[PDB]
Amino acid sequence: MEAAHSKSTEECLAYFGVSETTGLTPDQVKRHLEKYGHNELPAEEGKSLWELVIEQFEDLLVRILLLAACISFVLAWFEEGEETITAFVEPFVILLILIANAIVGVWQERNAENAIEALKEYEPEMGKVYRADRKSVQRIKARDIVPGDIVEVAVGDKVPADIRILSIKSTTLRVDQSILTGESVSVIKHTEPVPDPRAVNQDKKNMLFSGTNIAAGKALGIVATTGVSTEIGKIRDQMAATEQDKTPLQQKLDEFGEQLSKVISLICVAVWLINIGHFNDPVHGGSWIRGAIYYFKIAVALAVAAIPEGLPAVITTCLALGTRRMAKKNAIVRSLPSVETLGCTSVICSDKTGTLTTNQMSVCKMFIIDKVDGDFCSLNEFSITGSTYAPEGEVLKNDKPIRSGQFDGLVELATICALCNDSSLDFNETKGVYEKVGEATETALTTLVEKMNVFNTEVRNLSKVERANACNSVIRQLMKKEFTLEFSRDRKSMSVYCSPAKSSRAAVGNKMFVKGAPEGVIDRCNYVRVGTTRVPMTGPVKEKILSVIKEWGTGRDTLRCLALATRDTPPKREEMVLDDSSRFMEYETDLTFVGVVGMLDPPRKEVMGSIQLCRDAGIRVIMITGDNKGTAIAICRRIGIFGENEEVADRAYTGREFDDLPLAEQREACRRACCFARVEPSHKSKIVEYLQSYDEITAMTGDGVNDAPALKKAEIGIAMGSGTAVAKTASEMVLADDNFSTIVAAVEEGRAIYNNMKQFIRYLISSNVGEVVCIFLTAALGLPEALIPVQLLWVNLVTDGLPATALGFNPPDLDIMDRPPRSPKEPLISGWLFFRYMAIGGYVGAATVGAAAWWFMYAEDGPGVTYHQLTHFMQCTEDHPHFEGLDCEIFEAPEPMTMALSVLVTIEMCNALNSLSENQSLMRMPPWVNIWLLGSICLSMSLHFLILYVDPLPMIFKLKALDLTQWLMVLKISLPVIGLDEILKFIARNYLEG
Amino acid sequence: MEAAHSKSTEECLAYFGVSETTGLTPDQVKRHLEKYGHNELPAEEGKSLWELVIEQFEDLLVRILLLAACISFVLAWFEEGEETITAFVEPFVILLILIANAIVGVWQERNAENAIEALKEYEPEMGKVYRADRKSVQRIKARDIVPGDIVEVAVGDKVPADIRILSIKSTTLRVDQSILTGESVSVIKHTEPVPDPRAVNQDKKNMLFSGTNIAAGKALGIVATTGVSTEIGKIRDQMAATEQDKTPLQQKLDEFGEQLSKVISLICVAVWLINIGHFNDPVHGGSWIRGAIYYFKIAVALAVAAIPEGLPAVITTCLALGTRRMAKKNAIVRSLPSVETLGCTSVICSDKTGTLTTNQMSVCKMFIIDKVDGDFCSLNEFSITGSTYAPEGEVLKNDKPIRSGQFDGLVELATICALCNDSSLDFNETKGVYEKVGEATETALTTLVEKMNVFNTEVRNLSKVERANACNSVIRQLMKKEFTLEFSRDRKSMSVYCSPAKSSRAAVGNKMFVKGAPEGVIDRCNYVRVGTTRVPMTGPVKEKILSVIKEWGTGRDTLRCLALATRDTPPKREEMVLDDSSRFMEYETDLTFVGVVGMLDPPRKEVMGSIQLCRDAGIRVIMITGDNKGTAIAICRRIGIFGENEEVADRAYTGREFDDLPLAEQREACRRACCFARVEPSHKSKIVEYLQSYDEITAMTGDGVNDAPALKKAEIGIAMGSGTAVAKTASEMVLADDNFSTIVAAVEEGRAIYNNMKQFIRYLISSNVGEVVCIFLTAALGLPEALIPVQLLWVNLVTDGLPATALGFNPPDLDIMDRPPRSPKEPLISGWLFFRYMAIGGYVGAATVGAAAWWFMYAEDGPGVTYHQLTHFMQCTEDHPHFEGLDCEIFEAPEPMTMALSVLVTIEMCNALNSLSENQSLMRMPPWVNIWLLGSICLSMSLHFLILYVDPLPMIFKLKALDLTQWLMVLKISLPVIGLDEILKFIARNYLEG
């Protein structure tokens, strides 16, 4: 029965066939349970440890490696030798990386929590009901509650299900519906029906929502819905149905894997089509087992050479480092992969109150009627200084200070602001400043009465904590506040019934003081106050009042206006029913206009600037506010979202206006709108959706469970640090300071990380290309392996990792935020950069193969065999091409490989420098521009020497220290790489600009 | 130059290019030093204190514990609690045991001395040489002496190197070569060359051996060898090259370690393969840190439960106790681990003189020629009573006493025995008995003349100290002993030149009296004496003499015979050269046979019995003697080594015969031989080696540096208490009384200790098996730890140690020496005993786990939770299986553990009783059969109560006094163990005999 709020208390009892005095019977309980299920959100679908592990081996590259590890293992086994001390090293290392891979994977799922599961923190363990099988109340598990049974709740209780209040046992009922919104401002409940079947939760004043808390009172009601059918349960289903896409990098990265896999296989067929000549060899001869071992040996090298093994860790380190960096600027990134997507932010949807504004309310203007005489009319406009809640400030007219007391209208004006208020002030000893207690808007009125001091009370004798509520307390003595008629979006106002203090047994004297939005409050005024006198509300004088209000609210002041009135002759107290909030407007009729107060919620001191940065960056900014359309636009013009005089007819919308548009026009409006006012519960989500239909990376702010869906959907859901635990867990980012400007600063930081990431990424994949060329060359020529798996792996994990990482600290371009948002489709490598790394690739391949093939032929301390047909053979079965002599395993010499390895290392330290900038030569962009990089290289070189001298190592990697002559040869083959790219860059700069 | 003895005095000077009058020059000294090195044995290779400590941590079990200590330490650290008062107890205790371990280890190396180092006590600090750089003699450090330089030595000097004597400055030169042999009987040196290049040291009468002492004289010689090249240095190299094997127990014990280690790891994988089900648990939930702590916690318990921590101390205590016990029977065991190997003695090689015999010589027969007439011939055989050196005794013919004086031949016979003698008698006031002075054989002759009294001298008027040498002194007046021609194995005889007393300036009258082995002495006799007359030696009469000698030496008398003769017309005194011992035989030519004396070296009064015990024990006995082959066999038949009439052709060998056999036949001969006569210097070693090639545990006796090698090699080298310091240090055992029977008695004692050791060893390892079953069970079921490290350790150190030790006093089987030597390979546990302890193991495991798991479920004062799925969980993260209630740490209750501990203690006190006998039921073998054991149990129980009540203790061990009901439960689960084994024994007795 989800329409309960609109049904009468009798109709809900009738619908479920239950008695308010006995509760459900055990038969109803069983039937209702089987029909509606248990009262709880579905349990997250289990993922076993083993199921998880298995997933950690789903990736295309981890499979290629896994396989290669198997071939490697088999090879290390089915062999012929005794140097087993380093036989299973290769397979183990490979395998270990996969293990490390899986460990991390598993470790992430253990310590990760999803927003959907955070919802269950709002469902209590127990609840209290009345079931026929007993007289007294029996508390049972909340999970066993069902639609239809009578439940009981009291202060401190966490509401167990969505309940239709049957009757309030206590004098009143106050509920804290903070988990939905964030405003712990408790709300009053009633039992009278809410007529509109489509009322939003905020107006279901006769409903209790599962997950909410009772602030005060005690009530009995009937359960309307449970489980996923409650308001919170529907929020859980919206989130559970939200499909979360991978970041642009993850998508480019996954495509690189597919392709990398598709290419590897293709090179194997290539290595085959080049040896098709073996079909022309004699049936007898050679070793069909050694050939197979050869081919299988290079697959392992191919596989290990094409995979940038250390890329996942470098990316991870950069991200973690950047994250700690963003937290320093008050931006708490929860999702590591979010830093990228953040840099691409295309549109930023921000709530106004507390994010664009400080939320520190203050009254700066207020006017009363000066005099009315026929068609003539004068008002008495004032000003107030002091933007804090502190009573420190003063009133002024024509900019000159006056005494509010000298004006009667201001005394009543101030009487209303004090009596018609549920908040106060409190001086905090610690902070040493006046803190507010209650509503920001209400405290502002409190702060106002203290600055006015209409009774010239001696407050300069009291301390800080004593003069806080001084002038108020004085006013609280002239009238006894009988009771108060709460505020309701329905009539948009609130009032307080008051009886004179020094009185007894009188039948006259009562007064009603009303406060609320100007339109309605003024429409119900039939009189206007002028000092102590009163006169019929005249059409013209009403326009005067309305015109000034329009001025303050729609002009540059962007003030929130409140109308203040008093019902001089309130209805007889007996003639009023304090239970039907529906009769409140009626009670607030025949009012007297006293005055108007305009308050300000000042824009953050940085928002003007940041909004501007966003325009410079091509990032759209959309404000979502509860202000009426008019003041909303005025605030946008003020902070710079809109230009002071530009047209915004179709760039700003209120919830209502938005709904009146058809699904096609709503979409259209979202691409152009920059101001959404008075938005419905289901709008943030629709807006993010429509924005995403134009491929825009959207950032959205919010809190409470209501915003969880939208936060989950947007690419960068953003939460306030002072927001609810659920909003946070549903967001990619948290704002420790709640400041809109933090978002901007983080998008920039995000642009800076990516640029650098794009560089270490291109640096590493680039080296894998070169590595596969060397393995392909050495196979297409039939030469002895220049490099082996263990060697490549050290380079891709250690040697090239340090530089790769250091590259993550490349200084940021100065035009960073002066360019539009990067396109998600933007590939990392393509075009001239594609051809460039192709060249570099072939260079490295050639350089590392020759470097080793050199030692064999032209080296001094080497088996000088100039063109000795290394190709022709490596069978030694003939030994004819070498008459006298007894040595063939010199091919397995470590020297030639050490020459190849050393070359790769040197070229890569060179290419690291070729990566400080995509196009700027090392002439304009100096190598020392990144000190970390230089330092990383020194460390990588020292590490290289490490494996070359510390005995266990050289034998494990199959290396041998080079002669000062051999090194010298390495530099002759390596260093030139810098020139090659310098030329290639020169070409991209002077012949590719247009 | 090690061939020096065979070279002339001129050739040695020539070989080294040195002059006898000037010595080496400083140039020769430097060259000779650099060529030959310094004159000293290499210094023992240093073992630093730190290097030692490190070795104390090489053992497999001390490493397992060391590791476990680390896990324990880490765990006690990375924890969550505040009961730190007993947090680091566990790790510290473990560590402490290792420390205690290392301390002992170090302490043993500090107070242990090796035989090789004892050799250096024989090298003097200084020596005296003549070097060209000086006229007078300069004494320098012995270490600086070298081959080639002229050295000088005088009475009291300890010979510094092996020196070839150049010339004897004193009238004669006497050297005490006792350190080589033991017979301090100084030997005479000469300078004439010894022709045989392979002469054994005993015949190098022109050599001085480094480490020997000059008894008399002064000589000059040239150094032949130094350092490890001297006779003593070669003995040092033989010993340094001897590889000493570990005892059979040490080998079984080390194998148990490997296996114990291999099993521990295997049970860890077992504890893992049983929890493979955790891969099917949800990714979220439980504590991955608590799981790890669990697994690591049981490894510590596994490690501590598998190791019999107190076994090394119990073994050590039993051995020390047994040792003090063996010393009471005159057996001084130096090596503790030797008591075992001694019990396994398979073959016992014993020297005859002083070990099988008393070495108290006495003449009991002697004959002269009665008359010779043509082919007719009669001898005059006699007998002598008195087996002491005491002059107390009498001569007799045909068993009737006569007067030696009435027979002239007996007067000369007696003249020879007195004059041709270098020994005497001395009556010891203290002992009150006649002590010998010199050679045992010679004193016997002295004692003989006193009993004969051929001159009827009045000796019954003199006291004890006065009649000792009475009859001799009388004979010493009839002849003036000019000089004496010493004995040499070469001619095997000795003589003395004598001139009449009452004479002056006569050219006739001189006489030579010869003494020696019969063959040669008789062969050089051309005449025979008959009273005072003489007649040509006739072939037949010579056979008469020879036949009787054969009879006395090869018959049951086993007498050592000496032939006595006089050269009636000795050569002119001027015609003799007293310097060339080579001309001595010639001087002793043309002799006159006077008579023969047969002396006895009586077998120890216990050897007959002990030899018999050895046959009953399957222990072979081999006699090593200097007697000729014949008398040697006769002595063996007499003491029972050989049967009176059995064949021994290939069971007895002389050194010579042995060498003539090829390496294959020598080996063969050693497995069958029981008599080695006239053995070479290198035979004891070869014999031990050949014996060990048949896997026999050999015991060998001996002394002097010559026997050190062999003593070191045999499994049980045995030294005489009256032996040299070096022989002792090279031996496993010392005989305070020199008695062969001590060896036997100690082998038996050795068999008794092992049987008992085998019992306490099986008792303790048995309990470790059961301890690992309980830890394994409790892990395979996931139950709460029934027992913890600290608890097990007290049991394996204190509780079970007392009983283990008491078991070392188990009465010995009566058939102890009625069975063959135990096989070294004999494993301690295997077969039905293996299965038996397996059962007992599973019993203890089950009993101690249930005992604790009981308290949890069926106990009255316990959290009765009958099948409460203790397995299902111990996470309390759910707390669902237990609705109402707030207590989960009741699992950490001490009660269940105290129940487990108490059970273990009781079962073990029961199993102690199951260990008095491997197969005899407690019905036939009563518990009180070992009073010490019963008493140990009472003490162990009292100690158990100790930790259960004296407050600091119960909290340290996590225990709590049991209710009279809980104890009662312990007895229900423990006591039955006695029945289980009783049944198991019953099965081994009635269904396993065959």
Ligand SMILES: C/C=C(/C)C(=O)O[C@H]1C(C)=C2[C@H]([C@@H]1OC(=O)CCCCCCC)[C@@](C)(OC(C)=O)C[C@H](OC(=O)CCC)[C@@]1(O)[C@H]2OC(=O)[C@@]1(C)O
């Ligand atoms: C000490 C504690 C434990 C638990 C241990 O594993 O000892 C084994 C072991 C190493 C041996 C075994 C133990 O073997 C087992 O208990 C079999 C495996 C099942 C246990 C699994 C528990 C859930 C001994 C203890 O026991 C039984 C009962 O069978 C007997 C014997 O030990 C001896 O003879 C002692 C040598 C001085 C050895 O087989 C021995 O290995 C050898 O090489 C020997 C020859 O030594």
Ligand code: NA
């Ligand atoms: Na999101």
Ligand code: NA
């Ligand atoms: Na020995």
